[PDB]
Design a protein around this ligand. Structure first.
Ligand code: NA
Ligand code: NA
Lengths: 357, 357
């Protein structure tokens, strides 16, 4: 039985001002942590985040709305709890911030299940291979080409053998020169992906795809808004590129629609907003059924367990480490899921207390 | 320019016996009010509500996240403000509770524009006919048959010439007997509609429709979950009934999807969660383009202006009045949009203050 649920909201400042085409101005991000304690004293950790806004709303949903579905319930019945939470915030919800709140809780419940079973989550889920390939997700749209190359050098020195850069500048010409510059810098066979963060129109995305074809990009992420199934399907049909998307999809149904409509060729769920490991694994099954690979976005320290338990995983985005006990090190383009019970992530809450909001 | 934005959250207690198939017993609805004041001292009123949970989260979004999109902005640029709010809460949002927060603000902005133009909203929007037909929407699933008819008499006494009852009981046989008793009670010329509130499975919904066909129901509302475009389109094709849906759709894109896939035959947007009047009117345009009628759900006091401005409107759902000054009276099955500047709704904030949370 669940005896305590602690929700906390922190504003973690970014070391550098990251920027993208849609919300560029990123100086800090909101972190919502959820700690769930059962009757035996074991505590599971879960967390989600937002960029610049909505953090307090998410924290409020956990604390005022979901708490009541947790206290007194058997934490071992994760699916049962997930459904109760989904329906608790269904009115006016069914997608949106409520799914991030649910993800944090779900993640904590699985952590708790892994701790009690004394086994790391990747094994608890089935177990495929703990060594997961990764890629550095740069948030560098407004970064000068010179510094873009430098950043790349740091990713390389850091162990990364795949890099993603931002695109979606006002003038396509600027993206073309930057991608061209980084391609010749990194080399011919180096995996290089781009992220437009929904910046282009359907026609603009296809136009951009033609202009970037010469550089053999590994994939183009979120060419336009995700809500447009028809238009994205058109981008898939005419761009001649792998089209990655999903960080902005928030329900299993969103992924079902996209897959069924062929509006993306590589699904990218974010365990912290798709509904937690529970929903993440279901999206993974959809991808496997459709003969698709599976990538991800965000919190790779938690995500590594999900991708280490599926056979079709590919480069995982590995863009809080300063506040972690023992974060994974990148070696030869990969990270290894830890073997401690649960997800193995431990945050320094004392140090985080300073950033509490 | 907007100089003040007051957000308040009230817990309006609800009587027992208000139940439907999936939301269960409704203990109370959380009312979020937004009052916006411009540099000339004019104030616009806007609001939205949730059932049982999520209210604090909604109020938090308006007060903490959207306030910054309002203060110092020209209230006259409703569409520009709408977009900035959509984008401010887009990460982890793009649907969900953020759309209800947005609707409250949008409704207040339109109210302010109508007050400043010294004209009622139905005229500001274009103007069709202020006399809008309505139907009584009961939340009576667990209500005994005898009480169901009793409630029906009260509705008739109230001026209603169309009634909706809840369906979705564990056993279809119960729904059939109840619908039959009400049909018998009202005469086969009386518009009787049913709301399953997403209770049935696709197969279950088709089976229910076959069983209820003898009673000539005006329409079946939300037979199953809204997320399932394919399944809903199948119900449309096989049920032989008008299929209404939309109260749980929260973006123009959701309505676009449903209409394109033919997953419903009668759209039912809710101005308080679809994005306000701004989005509601865009959904109405999609309905008109598709040769469909248009109905609605919730806050008929606000919604009356929307349906009074469109030619293809049909019965509007009607049923917070205890906190209103001049509530519209139902006469000969219709209500009349008042001709006062703006939406004309006035709430007793002194009385509501008592229920403030
Ligand atoms: Na993206
Ligand atoms: Na309904």
């Amino acid at each position: 039985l669940i005896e305590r649920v602690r929700t906390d909201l922190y504003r973690i400042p970014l070391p550098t001002r990251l920027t993208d085409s849609t919300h560029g101005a990123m100086m800090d991000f909101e972190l919502i942590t959820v700690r769930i304690e059962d009757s035996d004293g074991a505590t599971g950790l879960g967390y989600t985040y937002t960029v610049n806004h909505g953090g307090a709303a998410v924290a409020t949903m956990v604390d005022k709305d979901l708490r009541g579905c947790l206290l007194g319930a058997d934490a071992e019945q994760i699916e049962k709890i997930w459904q109760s939470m989904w329906w608790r915030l269904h009115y006016a919800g069914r997608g949106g911030h409520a799914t991030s709140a649910i993800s944090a809780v779900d993640i904590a419940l699985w952590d708790l299940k892994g701790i009690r079973a004394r086994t790391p989550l990747w094994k608890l889920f089935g177990g495929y291979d703990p060594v997961v390939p990764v890629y550095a997700g740069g948030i560098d749209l407004e970064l000068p080409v010179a510094d873009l190359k430098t950043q790349a050098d740091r990713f390389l020195a850091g162990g990364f053998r795949a890099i993603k850069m931002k695109v979606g500048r006002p003038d396509l010409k600027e993206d073309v020169d930057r991608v061209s510059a980084l391609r010749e810098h990194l080399g011919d066979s180096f995996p290089l992906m781009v992220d437009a963060n929904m910046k282009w129109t359907v026609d603009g995305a296809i136009r951009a795809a033609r202009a970037l074809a010469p550089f053999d990009l590994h994939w183009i992420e979120e060419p336009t808004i995700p809500d447009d199934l028809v238009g994205n399907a058109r981008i898939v049909r005419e761009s001649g590129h792998t089209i990655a998307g999903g960080e902005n999809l928030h329900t299993l149904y969103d992924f079902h629609n996209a897959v069924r409509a062929g509006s993306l060729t590589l699904p990218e769920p974010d365990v912290s907003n798709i509904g937690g490991y529970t929903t993440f694994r279901k999206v993974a099954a959809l991808a496997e059924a459709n003969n698709m690979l599976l990538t991800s976005h965000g919190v790779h320290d938690l995500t590594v367990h999900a991708l280490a338990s599926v056979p079709h995983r590919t480069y995982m985005e590995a863009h809080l480490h300063a506040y972690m006990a023992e974060p994974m090190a990148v070696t030869d383009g990969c990270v290894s899921a830890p073997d401690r019970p649960g997800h193995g992530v431990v945050l320094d809450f004392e140090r985080l207390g300073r950033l509490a909001v």
